From Swiss-Prot, chains A, B, C, D, E, F, G:
Pfam families: Ca_hom_mod. One of its GO terms (molecular function) is monoatomic cation channel activity. The keyword Ion transport applies. The gene is CALHM4. GO terms for biological process: ATP export. The lineage of its organism: Eukaryota, Metazoa, Chordata, Craniata, Vertebrata. May assemble to form gap junction channel-like structures involved in intercellular communication. Channel gating and ion conductance are likely regulated by membrane lipids rather than by membrane depolarization or extracellular calcium levels. Belongs to the CALHM family. This is Calcium homeostasis modulator protein 4.
Length: 267, 267, 267, 267, 267, 267, 267
């Protein structure tokens, strides 16, 4: 009964996607909490924030594609009629499974806002501030590059610092919501177009998916068993008894040519 | 006996709806407690409050529609007599299941009132207040935009601040109740009209719903088994034995054309 | 033996009603403790108290009616001799089950008294108080509207405040008892009239109720099984084997017209 | 063996009565501890104490009568020889079960004495007290109405207050004992008269009570089963198979008139 | 059922790789936390940081290759047509398993950044610093070599120290991301080329891998059993009974030449 | 099933080696923590550090060789063609098992560095230090010999002390890494040469190892049983019954010569 | 299965030796911690340290020899060809088991060093110390005899005391290592010579040891059973029934001579 509910969960797309999203959230939380500190330099703040913001998204997307064995088969079909559309639909389902990780990472990282502040702490528009008039441009880049990591300046500076930080957090969370909404809308219209383009009815589709899963599992079982039987026959020929046999009555001593023979697997 | 009560709960619309509502409430509580802070800017306070207030409602509604497989089938029927009314009724039941999430999120978020204060902290009507007479309009937008996040001004300011906050909380909770009542009334009249328009009697309807559930489960079971049998026959033809067979007496070595053959699934 | 006592409790009207009442009490306690604060405005105090006092009662009553499936059947009978009286009696039992929630909520909320103080904190009769003579009417509405939420005024004000609060709590609890007594008396006379009007004897009534419960459960079981058998025959016709069969000897490959055929359920 | 001792307790009148009394005591304790505060007004103190003292007694008595199904049957007999006396005896046993709740509530509430002090804190006889000579009658009602809730006056006032409180507690507990004794004596003489008037011997009575319990349970079992059999026959006629049957060989498709037919239950 | 899921995990490449990565991370954390301290010398800081950075990577890579028994067989094939490509593919899978450890160690050690600071604390570009103008070159190497381990100098020195440390941490984490991205991209293009060059189809490949695993396990089982049977026959010849036999009736005392005989195993 | 996984672990070389390494690490940690203190003499510091560093390595190596029973058999073969190479390979496997302990002890003791500081605290190169110019050579050996155990001198001395200690820890850990790398490289090239020199194929080798293990276990079982049977026959001859027999009917009293006879075991 | 692994451990020489060593270590630790205090006399310090150092070693060695029953048999053989060498080998194995205790006790006691300091605290070479020049020889023995137990003298004395204590601890631990190395080397060369001198091959030896163990256990079982049978026959003769018999039909009353007879056991 345990394996019953195990497979029943395995089929559930919702459970697998929720697990992927929860794992991404937790991993991102730990990762940010431990290994994130702003450089607080002048030219290198941007790249530092954008790397954490973007790179793991690409990594996780490429992982979500490459870790699906079915993707390799469909690529082999493409790599050097109806079948084209069916391949497109399988690749579509693969994309649906894979895309959940980069977008959840991006959404949680933007909603938290910590990365964005560091990423765009130099682009702050400072035109109506009383302390920044006299300061030289280079000195301006220096004072502007210090705000996110820490505060050591007088109270007026920490005031303007907190105001800029609040503005940038707002911008970050707004980007997060724009991305969430755009992604859900795109996924909806994409499922709509996929259903519209499908040459199958609503019943043939279920038979199709079941056929795919059963076909893969059955061919792997059969191939493994047939190979084992052939190997067991090669060994019975060489030694003179079947490996599983009990109380074998005839044993054949191998010669010096038989070893040479069984060296090669005949593919 | 466990799966007995599991399916018995699965049928219960009341239990599923209560679970959806409890999960939405808890998720909203955590979400608000962790990632909510007002920008306390001048033009950007509104959008920030309205995003949290509205966007997750749209997200959850689109989710409640799209996650129901039956909706995809009915759309396929619509996508390029009595059947039209039956499709309308199924889509109606789907809507009934889906609508519970956005309205519970909206009701709990309005009753709590925290989002509304930030959302409409600029529109405060300040005409009979003694400190706001002399202040310039821009300075007025600046002092008005600071009240929700924190208080650093003298005691008179914190007094007027607390009064405005109480007024806005009142308005929020009133909107919450208006929405709850309007939604329940609309749901009631909608179920009434649906029952009135139904061409079925009170008994044919039960037979209908049972037929729908049984039809879907049975066709998926049958299709999966038939596909497995056909695949098991293709493998018996290629290898020479049935994958489940024990003590197979005849094994056929595949040729170089058979692999080419079994490459294609014949759809 | 577990399901034995489970159904035995399910039949018990007393247990179900006690559970409904306990759940309403607990929910009201939590709800009031968390999301209740007085606006302490001038015109908006009343509506705020009356909403919490009244709206959930209407909500819970409409819920207690609409969540009973039998009510839908009786409405369908009414919706576009002896049977009329029997329908009246069933609807009466439904009302008996449903009414327990709004009245328990109202009784507990009035006995607690917290809502009533806020609801009617403006209507206080202030004619024999020494501080309210000179105060202007608008200023009077302002001082009167502040008493429930908090006290910041001198000791004389907190004295008169506590006195008004005690008077209003008294009025609230008295209303609570009047409502409890009126409701119990009405329920008693209503059960009396229902028994008096019943055209059945004391024995035919038991047979009647048992007939109703058995009729509903049996027709749902039978209809579900018959639909499953018909579906299993349609699938045997299409595929060539019965879904439950083991070691099927004849498999029929479907054609391109059979899929079209089984697309429609024949209702 | 569990249901054995469960029914054995169910028969025990002593256990059921002890449970009712313990539940009433605990409920009264919680109720008084949470929702009881004196108004400390002038004209409204009395009604406030008398409501808590009396109303729940009436409520619980009407509940103890109305919750007994047998009472409904006997009323139906009365509602529009030996049988009259037997009905009187059944109604007598019902009264014996019902009366335990109001009298236990009254006894515990009077023995505690908290309600009585508030109920009769205005009627105090103040004729030999040195501070009450000069005070005007209205001022006297004001000072007299403040004693129970709290003490803020000088030490002489708190002295006379504590003395009045002790006197009223004494009166309350004395009333409690008078009520307990009167109730037990009345119950004793009432059981005596009931035994004296009973036209049955000491053995016919046991057979009678057993007959009543067995008659009710048996008729409900039989009626339910007979109704189920008749319903199962109506369904066999409509569908063509009995709902419990396994491997049904003949299935009859219903026509459009059969649904109309089975719509009505034939009562 | 335990060994079922044990082997099912054993097959999972993802689980084994995740376990290797987690173990490497934990071991690196402990190792760095306990046995890492900078020498804070002048010429020897570099080698000290580069050893920890690089050497364990080489060690773990050579371990990941050498601990795979299959690698020894393929090397024996190489050591003094289609088979060459198949050997290349097996060696490729071995590389895929092995490479996960050195790159995870390098990535975690660079992302942490502690090693890099010590490794390149001498190469700091000091051209625009006010305290380093006058200092002699040798004294410069001395002050520059002290920053990572500890701070004892005045506040200006600890300021410039913290700035250099932040710059070097930035450079380290950037190198970490460059390495992660380059490694994932190389692995992707490498799997692509391997799939492109594979002379097998998508089905022959599964049969191939299953054949390899079954062939190895079966030949080891068979060889062990055959050797045991031959040994049991040599012992039956020498002693006169089979080691497992019960109630042996004939025992042969060995002579002084038989011991000489059984001394040699005949290979 | 327990003994199943017990033997399966017993075969695992990796598990046994990991256990040996963990035990060596823990034992070394305890040993160093409890019984290690520097003498802080002048001529005797070196020997004291080198003993702990080196002696347990020799001890553990000789133990790893001598505790393997197979080593005794191969030595007996050597002690006063193909067989020589096979003996070399067995001795090689023994060495592979044995070498893991001394090198792990050496690596952990060097990486920790505590022993090395004491071992080479006299050889410190003191040529560019301001306090050591004037001090006489003997006094120099005295001040130099005190640094590791404790510090009682002024702050300048503890400064130079900490610097020397850091330098020596660096040298120790560098030696540790050099030893680890040299050992792994030597083990790799040694396994390579052993595989290259092996006159067996990749399959004959598995049969060989299995033959060795089975041969040893079987001959010990057979020899023990045969000896027991012969002894049981000597006792049956002397006493007149077989030791395991039940309900022996004939008992023979031994004479005074039989005891003399059974005194000798006939070897 | 429990006795299976119990005997399997019993055979393991390594487990028994490890247990002996652990028990000796723990016992020595407790013994030293509780009952060890230096006399701090002049002539009696030496004997006190040497007793604890040496005597328990002799005790434990004599115990390890005398507690082995096989040693008694071999001594009986010696006490008033090939057999001499076989006896030598058995006595050798006994020595191997016995020697582990005295050497572990000596090694742990020397490595700890506490005993040695007390044992040789008088022999300290005091020739280059400034306080010991003037002191008279007897006074020198008095000051020298006080250092180990406690310190009450000025700081210069505690300095020279700690230095002497460190020197003596060094000497102790060096002796410990010399003893460990000498013992392991002697054991190795001794096992080598024993294997070299053994007239048996590598297989006859296993048969020999198994024969010895089986011979001892079997003769004890047989002798016990035969004696029990003879005793049971003497009792059957005297009483007239066999002690284990059930429902004995014939009972013989003993006479006054039979008691005299059964008094003697006939040896």
């Amino acid at each position: 009964t345990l394996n019953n509910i195990v497979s029943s969960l395995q089929r559930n797309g919702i459970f697998i996607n929720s697990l992927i999203a929860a794992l991404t959230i937790g991993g991102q939380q730990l990762f940010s909490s431990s290994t994130f500190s702003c450089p607080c330099q002048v030219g290198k703040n941007f790249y530092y924030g954008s790397a954490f913001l973007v790179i793991p998204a690409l990594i996780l997307l490429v992982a979500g594609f490459a870790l699906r064995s079915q993707m390799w088969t469909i690529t082999g079909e493409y790599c050097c009629p109806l079948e084209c559309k069916l391949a497109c639909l399988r690749f579509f389902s693969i994309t649906g499974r894979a895309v959940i990780a980069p977008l959840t990472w991006l959404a949680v990282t933007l909603l938290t806002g910590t990365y964005y502040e560091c990423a765009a702490s130099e682009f702050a528009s400072v035109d109506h501030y009383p302390m920044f008039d006299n300061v030289s441009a280079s000195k301006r880049e220096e004072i502007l590059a210090g705000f996110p990591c820490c505060r050591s300046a007088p109270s007026d500076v920490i005031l303007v610092r907190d105001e800029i930080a609040l503005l940038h957090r707002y911008q970050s969370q707004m980007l997060g919501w724009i991305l969430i909404t755009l992604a859900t809308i795109a996924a909806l219209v994409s499922c709509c177009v996929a259903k519209c383009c499908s040459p199958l009815t609503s019943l043939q589709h279920c038979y199709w998916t079941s056929h795919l899963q059963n076909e893969r599992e059955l061919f792997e079982q059969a191939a493994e068993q047939h190979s084992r039987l052939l190997m067991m026959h090669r060994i019975k020929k060489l030694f003179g008894f079947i490996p599983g046999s009990e109380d074998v009555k005839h044993i054949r001593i191998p010669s010096c040519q038989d070893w040479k023979d069984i060296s090669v697997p005949t593919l």
